[PDB]
Amino acid sequence: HWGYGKHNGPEHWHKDFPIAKGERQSPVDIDTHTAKYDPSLKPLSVSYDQATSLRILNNGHAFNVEFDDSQDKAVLKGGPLDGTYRLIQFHFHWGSLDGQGSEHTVDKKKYAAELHLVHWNTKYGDFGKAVQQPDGLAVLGIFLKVGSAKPGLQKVVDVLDSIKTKGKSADFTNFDPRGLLPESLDYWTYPGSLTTPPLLECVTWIVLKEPISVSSEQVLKFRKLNFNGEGEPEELMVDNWRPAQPLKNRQIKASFK
Numbered sequence: 001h002w003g004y005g006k007h008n009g010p011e012h013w014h015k016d017f018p019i020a021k022g023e024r025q026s027p028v029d030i031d032t033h034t035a036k037y038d039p040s041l042k043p044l045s046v047s048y049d050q051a052t053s054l055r056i057l058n059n060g061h062a063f064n065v066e067f068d069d070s071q072d073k074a075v076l077k078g079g080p081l082d083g084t085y086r087l088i089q090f091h092f093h094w095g096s097l098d099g100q101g102s103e104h105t106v107d108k109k110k111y112a113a114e115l116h117l118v119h120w121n122t123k124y125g126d127f128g129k130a131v132q133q134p135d136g137l138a139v140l141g142i143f144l145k146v147g148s149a150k151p152g153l154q155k156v157v158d159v160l161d162s163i164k165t166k167g168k169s170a171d172f173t174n175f176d177p178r179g180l181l182p183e184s185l186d187y188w189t190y191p192g193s194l195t196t197p198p199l200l201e202c203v204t205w206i207v208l209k210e211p212i213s214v215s216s217e218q219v220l221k222f223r224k225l226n227f228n229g230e231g232e233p234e235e236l237m238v239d240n241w242r243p244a245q246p247l248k249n250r251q252i253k254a255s256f257k
């Protein structure tokens with residue numbers, strides 16, 4: 001079954017998921033000199049005041065903080081998007097080393113980690129329908145660099161002990177995802193895909209220009225998670241990122257100059 005190792009990793013995925021070699025795969029390298037400023041792009045609208053977090057889950061590939069998406073509580077709108085997208089979960093991808101871990105890269109630069117806030121288009125009724133549509137998801141991607149601590153991340157860090165292994169979950173109510181955002185909402189955008197199997201080509205990617213800074217201790221605690229389940233040999237959950245994929249016939253647009 002797929003993973004991130006030498007025998008089941010990104011180089012293998014195309015055998016079960018042939019869309020891995022498709023025309024709008026993610027992540028990509030963001031070449032900042034080739035991205036074009038689009039003055040018709042609108043500012044992002046991030047409305048997280050009514051967000052309702054529920055649970056945090058180690059799913060064997062990352063950990064997801066899950067939200068109540070049965071109503072318009074935490075939504076993303078504007079930017080390149082038409083319509084309203086509901087926040088369903090966020091998760092991260094990270095490295096074994098501070099110099100690697102992000103999925104997108106910027107002028108080939110790799111960050112220590114990358115946050116994905118996953119949203120689905122309410123015109124499609126449910127997340128399972130949305131992933132079957134070319135405009136079904138909008139994922140807001142935020143780079144993490146190692147430096148000073150991110151205070152709004154610490155409640156996530158402190159619960160990871162309780163979800164060490166695959167299949168463990170814990171209650172995670174009353175978490176405010178606004179504490180994970182950088183100051184600026186300047187962004188790059190392009191059409192892409194999920195970055196893990198089934199690799200569906202259903203995502204409008206919105207990647208913020210400004211990284212957030214997390215401490216070395218915070219990302220160190222990410223790296224103590226386990227890919228394995230309890231009672232299985234320990235496999236540290238590190239390097240759960242897909243490398244950059246060919247841009248093919250796509251243009252990355254910038255909301256800024």
Ligand SMILES: Cc1cc(C)cc(NC(=O)Nc2ccc(S(N)(=O)=O)cc2)c1
Nearest residue numbers: 116118127128131139193194195196197
């Ligand atoms: C509809 C459905 C049902 C189940 C049980 C799982 C999934 N998988 C899914 O949503 N995966 C997913 C993969 C990658 C991203 S990313 N890394 O591009 O933000 C988000 C969701 C999708």
Ligand SMILES: [Zn+2]
Nearest residue numbers: 091093116195
């Ligand atoms: Zn992701």
